A paper describes a structure:
Recent proteomic studies have identified a novel [name]/2 complex in [name] and Caenorhabditis elegans called the MiDAC complex. In addition to contributing to the assembly of this complex, [name] also mediates a chromatin-binding activity that is likely to be important for substrate presentation to the active catalytic site of [name].
Human [name] (56–147) crystallized with six molecules within the asymmetric unit. The structure was solved at 2.1 Å resolution using MAD phasing with seleno-methionine substituted protein. It was immediately clear in the electron density that the protein was arranged in the asymmetric unit as three dimers. Each monomer consists of a long amino-terminal helix divided into three by two distinct kinks. This arrangement results in a large buried surface between the two monomers of 4083 Å2. Remarkably, this represents 69% of the whole surface of the monomer. The core of the interface between the monomers consists entirely of non-polar amino acid side chains. The Dali protein structure comparison server identifies no structures that are significantly similar to the [name] dimerization domain suggesting that this is a novel fold.
Numbering used by the authors:
A (entry chain B): 62 to 130
B (entry chain A): 62 to 131, 142 to 147
The structure:
Amino acid sequence: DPAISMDLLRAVLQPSINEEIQTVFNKYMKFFQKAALNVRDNVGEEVDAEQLIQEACRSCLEQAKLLFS
Amino acid sequence: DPAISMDLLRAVLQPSINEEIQTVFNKYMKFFQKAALNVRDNVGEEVDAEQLIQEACRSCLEQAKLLFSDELPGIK
């Protein structure tokens, strides 16, 4: 299955690609942190700021898939 | 819902983040291109090499979501 061989290469490259993606996101993290703290500061204790930050980061990656449509 | 402020920020940052992601993937693209051509050469004409490359790139982004989930493949 052609998708499987591609996937084996993908797995090989993932650790390097992850490291560079982390370095990219580190530059933006402060913006997400501030915005998520803002939400918590306005709404209250029942807002999990860390979870808002993580969801927003995962969404960015989801939307970045449109680079490869 | 006030937490939609996260989405809006995200939409604002996306173009910049997308440019840097592209720059990252350009360094690895030659591996994916060679592998996809190898598959097409060894299976036949009905393999779309471009589509194999794209699907592998999207999978990379999917797996990169583990960086931001509650160990992780990395270079450190």
